[PDB]
């Protein structure tokens, strides 16, 4: 019990960045049951945590079947020696009953901020297909982690497609993330109070254009060029690689060489991402609202 106070101090710092605060509420709008569950203890849930509960949850979700161990620079035998030894327990395992049921909806929460945060996402595919990659293509198509500091990013159409029809400071990024049983692809924006709705369609209708069959195939290459390299530059680090190793493990249990991965990257057809992109506007979409809502439209305006 004595470790209760740590929680708030914990739960505090992350909540500074609303982008943090924005993520969780979002998952409510797209789901119902499980995925929407926070990474952070609900508030009355804090005085609520007994020991016995844990130990059950300890053993229940802990099984030799679900546990995956990775070594790095050490003899496989010393790895393999201790491996089955201590780590063999049960059983019990894995209780998968959450399909998460992607479900549309939106949520709006009111602050007094001068810079609004809002996102719009449609369900994208599950991880482990070129489809999620199509969005993973389609993200680096539209979306950009900054490749040049301070730069107004021209190669990103949307950002340009925004600022062309819009005004003074703002920031724009499209969002994609996936999991086992689904993925979530969309865009998320931060602008000013009046700026909000303006950015939206200007960004939103811009998406339609590619959903109209508009594409530049060299961009696909550059995207791949970006996509491949950026992927590499992430995997090139040891620990980033360390994750990506065992990320496979609890997923598949095999290892795809990055080469074939790169081959897989090329494998994506153009109209693929197009139709994938078509789905995005073509399906029930979800919203979360953080900021002054004064001008903020609902989904019905979209």
């Amino acid at each position: 019990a004595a470790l209760q106070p740590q929680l708030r101090i914990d739960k505090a710092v992350a909540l500074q960045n609303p982008q943090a605060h924005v993520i969780e509420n979002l998952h409510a709008a797209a789901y119902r049951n499980a995925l929407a569950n926070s990474l952070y203890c609900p508030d009355y849930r804090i005085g609520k945590v007994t020991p016995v509960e844990l130990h059950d949850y300890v053993q229940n979700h802990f099984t030799s079947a679900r546990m995956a161990l990775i070594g790095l620079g050490v003899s496989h035998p010393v790895l393999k020696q201790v491996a089955e030894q201590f780590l063999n327990i049960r059983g019990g395992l894995g209780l998968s009953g959450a399909k998460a049921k992607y479900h549309g909806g939106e949520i709006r929460e009111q602050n007094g901020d001068s810079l609004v945060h809002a996102a719009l996402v449609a369900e994208s595919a599950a991880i482990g297909s070129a489809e999620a990659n199509a969005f993973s293509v389609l993200q680096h198509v539209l979306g950009a982690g900054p490749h040049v500091k301070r730069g107004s990013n021209a190669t990103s159409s949307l950002y340009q497609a925004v600022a062309k029809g819009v005004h003074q400071p703002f920031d724009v990024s499209a969002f994609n993330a996936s999991y086992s049983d689904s993925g979530l692809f969309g865009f998320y924006t931060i602008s000013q109070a009046a700026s909000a709705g303006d950015v939206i369609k200007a960004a939103y209708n811009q998406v339609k254009t590619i959903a109209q069959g508009n594409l530049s195939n060299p961009d696909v290459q550059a995207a791949k060029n970006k996509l491949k390299a950026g992927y590499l530059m992430s995997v090139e680090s040891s620990e980033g690689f360390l994750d990506e190793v065992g990320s496979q493990a609890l997923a598949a249990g095999s290892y795809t060489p990055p080469s074939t991965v790169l081959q897989q990257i090329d494998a994506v057809a153009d109209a693929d991402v197009i139709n994938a992109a078509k789905k995005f506007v073509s399906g029930r979409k979800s919203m979360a609202a953080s900021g002054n809502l004064g001008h903020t439209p609902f989904i019905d305006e979209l």
Partner: peptide, 22 residues
């Protein structure tokens, strides 16, 4: 929405204060 190197966000504490992420 910031991930762009990866899927979404983070939770880490060991020592070092704590880390959120894209």
């Amino acid at each position: 929405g910031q991930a762009a190197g990866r899927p979404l966000v983070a939770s880490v504490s060991l020592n070092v204060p704590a880390s959120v992420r894209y």
